[PDB]
């Protein structure tokens, strides 16, 4: 909820702190690699929340077989592809990483046919974190 | 250590990671949220050695030639240490002390993905600058890294 007593580390605390939170994230298996947490967890998030299974390194085939991108982005004050998939999952967290909005945007849709699917993952991503934690 | 981190949600260990970042950024001593590891030493040798961060080259040192920033921290998982005049390459331990600090000239970059092992940390155009970064950096920042 709150983090101005992090005014109060130094620069190495906070290093330290920073790999130690990334090594207990990968040590539950919610993020696969170091490089990129928010993008990794949306995708421990969705597919966790929508049976679907992840790809090594399209970033997860569905429930249906379909090919599907997941990308992540963090609301803040401060600031082609070439390649086959069905659909994207779009996930945008707040400032703690509730869901302001997710959507599904199917690959044809390039530079209206969107739909927002945030009551479905916010619902089914409770159910699953609630269920895991028994 | 942080060994409380185990009691905490993966929402809550996110949120913290992100406001880390933030706190590093405000402080100038992060650039971008990327490259932490990376951007702390260029932090750190941009203040000990008086050069200016760029946005191809990292930085411009203070006689004016362009070089390139490297950084690795040395894990459990390994210790492998695997345009611009010169590269310099920072390891660090799981601390984030400086286990070692190299200059390595474009020129011998040619001669030789650089491994600093072997014959390339022998050559006399290489040279360490952990002692310089040790003695040019200021007080407050010598304190963390000893």
């Given at each position: 909820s709150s983090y101005d007593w992090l005014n109060a580390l130094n620069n190495l605390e906070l290093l330290s702190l920073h790999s130690e939170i990334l090594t207990q994230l990968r040590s539950r298996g919610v993020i696969r690699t170091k490089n990129n947490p928010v993008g990794d967890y949306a995708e421990w998030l969705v597919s966790n929340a929508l049976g679907m299974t992840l790809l090594s390194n399209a970033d997860a085939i569905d429930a249906d077989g379909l090919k599907v991108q997941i990308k992540a982005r963090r609301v803040t004050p401060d600031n082609y592809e070439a390649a086959d998939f069905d659909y994207l999952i779009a996930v945008i967290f707040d400032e703690t990483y509730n869901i302001l909005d997710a959507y599904k945007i199917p690959?044809?849709?390039?530079?209206p046919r969107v739909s927002s699917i945030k009551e479905d993952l916010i619902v089914r991503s409770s159910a699953s974190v609630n269920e895991a934690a028994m």
């Open positions: 690959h044809e849709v390039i530079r």
